[PDB]
């Protein structure tokens, strides 16, 4: 069907199984002193994390104070200059002998592809943390400073009123 | 190879986010009538803590199951209103998820 069937073990665990789970896990721990499914109550025991700390799904694999970059910068600049130079040479190829133009085209793309690699090491979450950091920091400083400004102006008004009433005495 | 129970339970949890899946599951009588399914739903609650929460793909179902948790004391009735209510309350629920995680 369109919707896959519920998992099979879901139907094994009734309320009686839930209430008898404590004694079952106590007995299992006492006896113990891929997990084989010898009893229907085994699944409620929390599954163990794989030792390799890896998870595979759909053909793809998955697994501290914030809780020479100049070399990369100059590499990027020289790569951009070489990319412009190669673009000029490739368009010249198109001009004179376009029949073999593709011979350079993908080459240029490789440099562009390398640029993407040069982005990968530069990857930005810390920079986003920084920018959010300063925006809420400056917002709270603005709120604070307007608080002492308003309380100070109220105090100044109170002192002026006190002087006015003392003069009228 | 045969996938482990981790993979199937995680995929079930992430598929629970679909409104069509929830509507289909609640359409059948014996799914809600059987206490086994709700027992499994309450068993699934323990994935809201790390490091299990680091392995999720769509955080919305995190509330949905919790919303489904509410369904055990709110009633089936309300199945018809489920798509409308999720569409209407998507903004504030996404905001509260962001507050729970992004802050």
């Amino acid at each position: 069907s369109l919707y896959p069937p519920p998992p099979p073990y879901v139907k094994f665990f009734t309320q009686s199984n839930l209430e008898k789970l404590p004694k079952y896990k106590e007995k299992k721990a006492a006896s113990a002193k891929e997990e084989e499914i010898t009893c229907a109550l085994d699944y409620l025991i929390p599954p163990p994390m794989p030792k390799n700390q890896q998870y595979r799904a759909f053909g793809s694999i998955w697994q501290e104070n914030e809780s020479n970059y100049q070399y990369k910068i100059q590499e990027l600049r020289k790569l951009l200059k070489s990319l412009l130079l190669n673009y000029l040479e490739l368009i010249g190829v198109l001009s004179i002998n376009p029949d073999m133009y593709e011979r350079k085209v993908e080459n240029i793309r490789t440099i562009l592809v390398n640029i993407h690699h040069l982005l990968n090491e530069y990857r930005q979450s810390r920079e986003s943390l920084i920018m959010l950091l300063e925006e809420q920091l400056e917002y709270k400083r603005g709120e604070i400073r307007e608080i002492e400004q308003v309380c100070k102006q109220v105090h100044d008004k109170l002192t002026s009123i006190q002087d006015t009433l003392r003069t009228g005495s | 190879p045969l996938p482990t129970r981790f993979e199937v339970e995680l995929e079930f949890i992430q598929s629970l986010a679909n409104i069509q899946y929830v509507t289909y599951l609640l359409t059948q009588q014996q799914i809600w009538k059987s206490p086994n399914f709700k027992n499994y739903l309450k068993y699934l609650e323990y994935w809201c803590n790390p490091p299990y929460s680091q392995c999720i793909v769509y955080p919305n179902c995190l509330f949905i199951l919790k919303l489904l948790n509410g369904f055990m004391e709110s009633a089936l009735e309300g199945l018809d209103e489920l798509p409308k209510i999720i569409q209407l309350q998507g903004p504030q629920w996404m905001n509260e998820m962001v507050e729970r995680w992004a802050n």
Partner: peptide, 25 residues
């Protein structure tokens, strides 16, 4: 003429009961 028209009694909240099954290829 027409004494009174009918009030709109639409029920979009109705979930419908369309059977879906031939999705797998």
């Amino acid at each position: 003429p027409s004494y009174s028209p009918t009030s709109p009694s639409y029920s979009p909240t109705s979930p419908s009961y369309s059977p879906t099954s031939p999705s797998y290829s």
